[PDB]
Amino acid sequence: EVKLVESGGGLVQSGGSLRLSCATSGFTFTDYYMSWVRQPPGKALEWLAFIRNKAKGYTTEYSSSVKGRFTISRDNSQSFLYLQMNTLRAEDSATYYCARDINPGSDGYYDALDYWGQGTSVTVSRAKTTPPSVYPLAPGSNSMVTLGCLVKGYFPEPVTVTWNSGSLSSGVHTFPAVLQSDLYTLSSSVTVPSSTWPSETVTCNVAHPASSTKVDKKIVPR
Amino acid sequence: DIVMTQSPSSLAVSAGEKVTMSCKSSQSLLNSRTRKNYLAWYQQKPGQSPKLLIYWASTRESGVPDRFTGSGSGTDFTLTISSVQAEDLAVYYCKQSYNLRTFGGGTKLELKRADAAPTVSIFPPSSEQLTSGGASVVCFLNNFYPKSIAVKWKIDGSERQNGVLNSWTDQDKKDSTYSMSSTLTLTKDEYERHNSYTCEATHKTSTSPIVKSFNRNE
Ligand SMILES: C=CCO[C@]1(C(=O)O)C[C@@H](O[C@]2(C(=O)O)C[C@@H](O)[C@@H](O)[C@@H]([C@H](O)CO)O2)[C@@H](O)[C@@H]([C@H](O)CO)O1
Numbered sequence: 376e377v378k379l380v381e382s383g384g385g386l387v388q389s390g391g392s393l394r395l396s397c398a399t400s401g402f403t404f405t406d407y408y409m410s411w412v413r414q415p416p417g418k419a420l421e422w423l424a425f426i427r428n429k430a431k432g433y434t435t436e437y438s439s440s441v442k443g444r445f446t447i448s449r450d451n452s453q454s455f456l457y458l459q460m461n462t463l464r465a466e467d468s469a470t471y472y473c474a475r476d477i478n479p480g481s482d483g484y485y486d487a488l489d490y491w492g493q494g495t496s497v498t499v500s501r502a503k504t505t506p507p508s509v510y511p512l513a514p515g516s517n518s519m520v521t522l523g524c525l526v527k528g529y530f531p532e533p534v535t536v537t538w539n540s541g542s543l544s545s546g547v548h549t550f551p552a553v554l555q556s557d558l559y560t561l562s563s564s565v566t567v568p569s570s571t572w573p574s575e576t577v578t579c580n581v582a583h584p585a586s587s588t589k590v591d592k593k594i595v596p597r
Numbered sequence: 598d599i600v601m602t603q604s605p606s607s608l609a610v611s612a613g614e615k616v617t618m619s620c621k622s623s624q625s626l627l628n629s630r631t632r633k634n635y636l637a638w639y640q641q642k643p644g645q646s647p648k649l650l651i652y653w654a655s656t657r658e659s660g661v662p663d664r665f666t667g668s669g670s671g672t673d674f675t676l677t678i679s680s681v682q683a684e685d686l687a688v689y690y691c692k693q694s695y696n697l698r699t700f701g702g703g704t705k706l707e708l709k710r711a712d713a714a715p716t717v718s719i720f721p722p723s724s725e726q727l728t729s730g731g732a733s734v735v736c737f738l739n740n741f742y743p744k745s746i747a748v749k750w751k752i753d754g755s756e757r758q759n760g761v762l763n764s765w766t767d768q769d770k771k772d773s774t775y776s777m778s779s780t781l782t783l784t785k786d787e788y789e790r791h792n793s794y795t796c797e798a799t800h801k802t803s804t805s806p807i808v809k810s811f812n813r814n815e
Pocket residue numbers: 427431477479480486635694695696697
């Protein structure tokens with residue numbers, strides 16, 4: 376099974392540097408070109424660079440937008456792909472994806488980016504890291520009931536929310552974060568049969584990797 | 598410098614209908630020797646990574662349903678989806694790989710469904726927030742269609758305008774509805790000066806506002 380997992384995303388001050396990684400498994404790494412693609416919040420995908428396979432001498436190419444500024448490399452012994460990013464700007468803020476590129480020497484060569492990691496997020500900003508406050512949303516006072524969590528005042532993005540450790544997935548809405556005064560706020564709602572709450576527990580799980588915050592907040596009536 | 602552009606930027610279609618979207622390249626993506634066009638289409642569903650649909654202009658990736666058809670040659674290319682499903686909601690990107698790789702700007706495909714009234718829930722501030730001097734009141738408006746809606750907050754009958762932050766989800770991949778969240782943030786001092794807190798939703802499915810409230814002195 377082909378697997379690609381990006382890491383190293385985070386908050387970085389303008390002009391600073393940051394190096395992402397992409398761990399791979401489930402295929403002969405050195406046989407394949409590898410690419411990095413990125414996506415600013417709400418914008419289009421942008422191809423940034425690739426590095427060729429062993430037969431091709433592991434040579435590199437870059438898009439105009441990052442050439443001279445980013446460096447793509449690979450470690451063929453631990454099967455890692457890297458991207459060193461320098462002199463960072465606000466416009467470099469995005470989710471960065473590593474993607475398996477072509478093996479032109481393969482009898483099954485087809486030209487495309489066929490496997491993509493889940494992406495690692497990067498924010499380029501002078502603002503300070505701030506953990507979220509997580510507050511329960513219970514009705515003050517039929518059939519279904521809607522509960523929620525309010526995740527307030529954090530920086531930077533992202534945060535993740537699940538309910539009962541993912542075992543509640545249907546009936547969930549997690550709203551896109553909104554930025555205000557250098558601080559994000561987002562909410563999540565979950566809707567369950569009133570027969571199952573509060574007789575059964577409902578808990579939201581909130582993580583904020585930039586501050587290593589992990590929270591479980593039980594929604595109790597009141 | 599191959600420039601990719603796509604059309605339309607966005608559109609909406611009812612389930613079971615046919616969708617045609619277009620991709621143009623500033624130069625030919627065709628290798629005359631091999632007869633291959635270096636053009637691929639990717640699907641990106643909300644909150645997911647991009648997924649490969651088609652490569653070489655017309656070859657379907659394994660696992661991809663045949664309602665997805667890729668055609669075209671040289672500089673002009675077309676992705677067609679017949680009998681669109683609700684799950685097909687996504688941004689669709691074409692990408693040249695003839696000279697390095699360049700992505701188009703994408704086409705946002707949305708789905709038309711019957712109108713649906715929002716389900717509105719209001720939530721008072723938690724005692725844990727209050728204990729720190731702040732007071733947020735939240736309003737969820739869930740599973741409506743169409744997207745267009747307006748929420749008014751009223752404090753003791755009068756509209757409050759500032760302190761309000763709003764957010765809309767992407768379309769639901771299942772029921773093709775939208776949802777919205779509206780949060781009113783006050784200091785504990787402000788919140789304690791008033792009693793009635795009201796969230797009012799304006800949507801074409803109802804001639805009068807859809808209201809939820811609570812009283813602080815409840
Ligand atoms: C069928 C491929 C023929 O040219 C190759 C080869 O060894 O098969 C592969 C070429 O691949 C690239 C490249 O830049 O490495 C990437 C491909 O996705 C595509 O962009 C092609 C491009 O269409 C070639 O004109 O280039 C390349 O390595 C190539 C050498 O540059 C020339 O032989 O070799």
